[PDB]
A paper describes a structure:
In Gram-negative bacteria, the localization of lipoprotein (Lol) system facilitates the transport of these proteins from the inner membrane to the outer membrane.
After X-ray diffraction data were collected, the structure of LolA-HP was determined with molecular replacement using a search model obtained from AlphaFold. The structure was refined to 2.05 Å with final Rwork and Rfree values of 20.2 and 25.2%, respectively. The last strand, β12, links to β11 through an elongated segment that extends along the outwardly curved surface of the β-sheet. The concave side of the sheet forms a hydrophobic cleft, shielded from the adjacent solvent by the presence of a helix (α2) and an extended loop region between β6 and α2. In LolA-HP there is a proline (P99) at the end of β6 that precedes the extended region, but no other prolines are present in the segment that fills the cleft. Structural comparisons showed that LolA-HP has a deeper hydrophobic cleft but lacks the negative electrostatic potential critical for binding polymyxins.
Author numbering: 24 to 184
Write the structure that this text describes.
């Protein structure tokens, strides 16, 4: 009664992948990085190119660290919308994609060769965000400390918005 993709989501406890992030508008400026996610609701997005940014996320908040600025911006989250939460919520659609809606934003996951392949949603400006995964790993061992925002030094301005 579970498809192969449905079993992956049921059994999933961690995930890592390289990603390409495209936002559709004037000219596609494409961001590249690495994603690590882990139960219960932890996620880390490391952008490597062309800008370096680290986005730590859990159930309660998101931390956006901009090393070029020596600044971290913290936003409390009212809805659980981290990557692992979304996956554990997806339901299979008639077209074979997977979807879920959280706070009026619909997220669409497509699989390929048995692994998460792409994630698509509108941002809060109604712009379409497409994230494509490569070198995807199902249930890798990801050490917990990777997820701890450790400045590490203390030049960092902490901005709350």
């Amino acid at each position: 009664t579970l498809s192969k993709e449905e079993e992956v989501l049921q059994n999933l406890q961690s995930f890592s992948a390289h990603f390409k992030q495209v936002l559709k508008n004037e000219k596609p400026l494409v961001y590249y990085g690495v994603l690590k996610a882990k139960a219960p609701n932890w996620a880390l997005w490391v952008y490597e190119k062309p800008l370096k940014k680290e986005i730590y996320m859990n159930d309660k908040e998101v931390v956006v660290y901009e090393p070029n600025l020596f600044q971290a911006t913290i936003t409390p989250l009212k809805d659980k919308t981290d990557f692992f939460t979304i996956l554990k919520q997806l339901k299979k659609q008639t077209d074979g994609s997977f979807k879920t809606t959280i706070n009026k934003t619909t997220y669409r996951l497509v699989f390929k060769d048995g692994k998460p392949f792409s994630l698509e949603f509108k941002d809060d400006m109604n712009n379409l965000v497409t994230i494509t995964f490569s070198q995807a790993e199902i249930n890798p061992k990801i050490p917990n400390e990777i997820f701890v925002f450790n400045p590490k030094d203390e030049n960092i301005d902490i901005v709350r918005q």
